[PDB]
Amino acid sequence: YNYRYRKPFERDISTEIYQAGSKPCNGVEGFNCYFPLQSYGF
Amino acid sequence: VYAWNRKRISNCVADYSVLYNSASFSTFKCYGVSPTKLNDLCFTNVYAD
Amino acid sequence: FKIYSKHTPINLVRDLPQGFSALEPLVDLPIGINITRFQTLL
Numbered sequence: 001y002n003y004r005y006r007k008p009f010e011r012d013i014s015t016e017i018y019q020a021g022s023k024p025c026n027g028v029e030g031f032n033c034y035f036p037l038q039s040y041g042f
Numbered sequence: 043v044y045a046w047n048r049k050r051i052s053n054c055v056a057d058y059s060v061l062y063n064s065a066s067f068s069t070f071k072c073y074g075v076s077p078t079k080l081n082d083l084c085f086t087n088v089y090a091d
Numbered sequence: 092f093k094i095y096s097k098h099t100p101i102n103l104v105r106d107l108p109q110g111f112s113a114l115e116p117l118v119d120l121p122i123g124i125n126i127t128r129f130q131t132l133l
């Protein structure tokens with residue numbers, strides 16, 4: 001679970017949710033509020 | 043990959059032909075330079091991201 | 092992040108002096124911080 005994803009050498013000590021729909025997703029998971037830090041099958 | 047280590051390799055010398063010959067990597071490629079030439083390079087830094 | 096800068100004693104102190112000058116590269120910092128803000132300090 002320790003490997004996950006959040007631009008051209010973009011970096012900060014921060015991360016935020018993708019608007020996969022019109023919703024203001026508040027970082028919260030849901031249908032068309034899909035969580036950005038998806039777990040990896042490592 | 044979000045917190046990716048922007049390691050500013052700096053104030054130093056190396057051999058890169060060893061990296062190019064190394065079996066340690068499943069992939070190795072160079073873009074602005076062809077990978078045989080790398081021992082002839084000099085830089086301000088290398089950000090080993 | 093780079094500083095170009097230049098320092099001198101002056102005759103006129105509250106508003107900008109006329110005549111020519113140039114600022115010299117006293118700093119470079121290849122540190123990669125994605126600046127969007129700044130502030131003055133005492």
Ligand SMILES: *[C@@H]1O[C@H](CO)[C@@H](O[C@@H]2O[C@H](CO)[C@@H](O)[C@H](O)[C@H]2NC(C)=O)[C@H](O)[C@H]1NC(C)=O
Pocket residue numbers: 007008009010011125127
């Ligand atoms: C410097 O910071 C800004 C945000 O302050 C970065 O903006 C992101 O850019 C990508 C496209 O490259 C967008 O999809 C993101 O939505 C942007 N993020 C935010 C929070 O606005 C900018 O890319 C950074 N500079 C570099 C060169 O990475």
